[PDB]
Amino acid sequence: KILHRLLQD
Amino acid sequence: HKILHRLLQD
Amino acid sequence: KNSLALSLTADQMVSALLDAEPPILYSEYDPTRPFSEASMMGLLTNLADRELVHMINWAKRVPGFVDLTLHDQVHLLECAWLEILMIGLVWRSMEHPGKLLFAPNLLLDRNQGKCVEGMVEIFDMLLATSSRFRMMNLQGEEFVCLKSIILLNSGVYDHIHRVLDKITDTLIHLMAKAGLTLQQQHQRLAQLLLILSHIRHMSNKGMEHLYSMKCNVVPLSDLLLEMLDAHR
Amino acid sequence: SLALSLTADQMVSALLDAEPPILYSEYDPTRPFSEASMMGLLTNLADRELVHMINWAKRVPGFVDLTLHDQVHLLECAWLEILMIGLVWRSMEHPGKLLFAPNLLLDRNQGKCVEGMVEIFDMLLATSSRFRMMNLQGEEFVCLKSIILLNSGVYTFTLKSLEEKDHIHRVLDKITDTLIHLMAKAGLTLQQQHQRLAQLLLILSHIRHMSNKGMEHLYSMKCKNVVPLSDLLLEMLDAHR
């Protein structure tokens, strides 16, 4: 997911 | 005319 | 012009609400465990329909409610009816973890909550809310306050606002009577009220579900259809 | 946790400095008024706001103590609620108006799309009217927005790992304390503190309702291929089925 990716940054 | 109107009266 | 509700004491407000309480109704005495979409929703529709008649007469006994115009009463009931049904369901399901006591002769679990696309999500939410109320040791006096708040708040968008404040006072009064510290009072108050947001969510999702059942599973009553159509 | 260590004043300071900026839209008065292009502006605006919201959430005390899956869930659940309370907050000083952006002031007449959309619009207006009459403070608003993030999906969630839900409850209790602290500092009596606290939290029920009705329209929108929904917005929307 995009949301999961942005939360990892 | 809703049933709710009638029921709220009596 | 002035409402009797505001002139009531806290104990008077509690007694008025306790006395206004609708009865716990029974479902059909057909022994069958409902698994079919038609059978289960058939039982729930019939139950909710009879509960609604009691709810309407309950609402008129909620202090401040009859002081509103008939059209405002109609509006608040159309807005909150499923919320009110659900918190009642959640309340009487407290002492039955993992189950929903729709009626004393109708306890459903998650397994029956399957079988139909769109239930088990809402079913799980109802269970979590029930479990939450149980862990907080929600009292009957608190429950009737919350249910009344839902009736008056959900479709509120000066009189209602002051009545809502009055019920808030009543909740605090109950917690203080229960021997809670001031810190525990405002914390518990906050916890209770935040659950109302979940109840709102469950109602909205449930309402969507009902429109889907409406567009031809089980025949709805004219009353249910009008309460349903009120949510567009 | 660091959140359970913060004082009420430190909690407020933390939230205040984690505040996202107010973004502009691409609104142009010299452009025609396609209420599908209004939704164009709002979609584009919401999408850019989401990026700031995500980085804002990671600076909400206690949020990053949770697993990535739980962080995702809470944001998926609350994103529109959080956008809407932000919208309502910045629209306070504008009676009858919604301030979507500093360059985008819409009332219910420059309108719309209607029956249903005008309803959501009216509800937002009413909520804003409520914040204004309550004289909602900035410190109270950042508490409320943080409560929504943590509360809106605290249920609706494997096994064993359930003390994380306990941790969320602990942080929520702290924010409750912070709210009361703010009201006490404001000189409100005990009765006035409890009443205002209740009034604030009952508003979250309205914000939840507006989000669900708004989500319905966005799903109704999507399937009609109106606005081109962004990739992130599509994923956030699919979370609500």
Ligand SMILES: CCC1CCC(=C(c2ccc(O)cc2)c2ccc(O)cc2)CC1
């Ligand atoms: C997960 C399924 C969910 C559907 C909605 C619920 C209903 C419900 C809620 C509380 C009750 O005491 C009685 C009935 C319901 C069902 C059918 C109907 O025509 C009206 C209300 C609660 C359960």
Ligand SMILES: CCC1CCC(=C(c2ccc(O)cc2)c2ccc(O)cc2)CC1
């Ligand atoms: C009455 C219209 C209503 C529609 C939903 C709202 C939106 C909204 C809310 C808050 C904002 O800061 C920015 C945008 C919105 C619009 C489109 C979209 O793809 C996502 C969110 C609020 C207004």
